[PDB]
Amino acid sequence: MIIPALDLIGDTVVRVVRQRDYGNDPLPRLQDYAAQGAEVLHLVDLTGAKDPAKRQIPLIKTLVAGVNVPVQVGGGVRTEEDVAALLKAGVARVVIASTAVKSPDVVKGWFERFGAQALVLALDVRIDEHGTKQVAVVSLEQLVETYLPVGLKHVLCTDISNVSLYEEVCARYPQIAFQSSGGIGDIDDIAALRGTGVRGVIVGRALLEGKFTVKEAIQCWQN
Ligand code: NA
């Protein structure tokens, strides 16, 4: 799957690493992502990620209501209440950050209550000098072990160290549906990831930049 994605600061669509400002119409943007055939969408609430007390619930309610396809939302999700709040806003899956790295027993609890189909674990992966896949702020393997007993199913992988990693880990963990994020700059990057075993590709920047349209991405990826 192609998974189009918007990063949000307040009501404002942005490019980040803040880099560029693209307006205050996330909804027509999303709806046009959907019109072209996107099956899943992806939001990051950077305002909430900065401080969770300012979680943009009303906004996210609106955005999720305005489209008729599942939406996954991340950004500062670090307590059970936040997960419930996001779900209560209509969100189809909650994307969890570094907490799932730091606090396995808590997060295991979230899995046990909400179920694994509702959660996505977001991991920044570093390949080090030695060739170990480590997980940013512990190895990938270690994490997968920690969460297999509670039915781990969805991982969002950003590589911050490209095809071959995904080939190997997708082969090692056939029970995990991997999502690649970052590293997309043109339609060819999408073609590249096509046969790797990766299940979903997060696409953001390239779309705002007009390199291609979601219809083109889908044409590519879906061969
Ligand atoms: Na697709």
Side-chain angles (χ1 to χ4, degrees):
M1 268 166 190
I2 295 304
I3 311 184
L6 302 191
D7 287 340
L8 286 152
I9 293 176
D11 207 1
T12 296
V13 169
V14 309
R15 217 179 134 237
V16 296
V17 50
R18 186 178 330 188
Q19 293 293 111
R20 203 98 57 176
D21 185 309
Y22 294 93
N24 323 287
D25 62 335
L27 187 48
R29 286 197 187 268
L30 288 184
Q31 287 175 340
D32 191 50
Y33 288 166
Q36 298 177 69
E39 280 181 304
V40 177
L41 298 170
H42 177 100
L43 298 170
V44 180
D45 180 7
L46 291 172
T47 290
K50 188 169 163 214
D51 174 282
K54 284 175 294 293
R55 178 70 63 194
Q56 313 197 60
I57 291 307
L59 175 61
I60 295 178
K61 280 198 60 155
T62 279
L63 298 176
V64 155
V67 299
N68 311 337
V69 290
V71 178
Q72 51 182 55
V73 179
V77 182
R78 293 179 177 95
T79 62
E80 179 178 358
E81 284 74 15
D82 297 333
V83 178
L86 281 160
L87 287 176
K88 209 155 288 202
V91 173
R93 291 197 288 244
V94 181
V95 189
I96 297 137
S98 63
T99 308
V101 196
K102 299 182 303 295
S103 319
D105 297 86
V106 178
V107 176
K108 275 174 225 187
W110 307 353
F111 277 81
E112 281 159 20
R113 170 183 174 194
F114 299 112
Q117 268 292 46
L119 296 178
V120 174
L121 287 199
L123 318 174
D124 294 324
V125 180
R126 249 291 186 81
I127 283 190
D128 64 9
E129 318 157 296
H130 298 174
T132 65
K133 319 207 157 57
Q134 300 296 116
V135 184
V137 124
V138 46
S139 52
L140 178 59
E141 166 59 10
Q142 186 170 357
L143 190 128
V144 174
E145 293 174 36
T146 306
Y147 288 109
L148 287 205
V150 299
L152 175 67
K153 176 57 185 170
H154 301 279
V155 177
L156 192 171
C157 185
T158 306
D159 168 7
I160 60 182
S161 170
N162 322 349
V163 155
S164 61
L165 165 141
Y166 287 114
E167 251 156 21
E168 295 146 14
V169 300
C170 290
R172 201 180 197 80
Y173 307 119
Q175 77 278 42
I176 287 172
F178 283 104
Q179 302 177 341
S180 70
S181 163
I184 305 299
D186 68 20
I187 198 69
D188 288 330
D189 294 326
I190 285 183
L193 294 159
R194 198 182 338 167
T196 53
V198 175
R199 271 223 67 201
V201 188
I202 309 299
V203 182
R205 213 169 42 68
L207 286 176
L208 301 186
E209 288 163 347
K211 311 310 186 61
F212 46 91
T213 61
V214 166
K215 172 71 65 173
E216 286 173 320
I218 290 174
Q219 266 159 24
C220 188
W221 172 258
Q222 303 283 17
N223 192 19

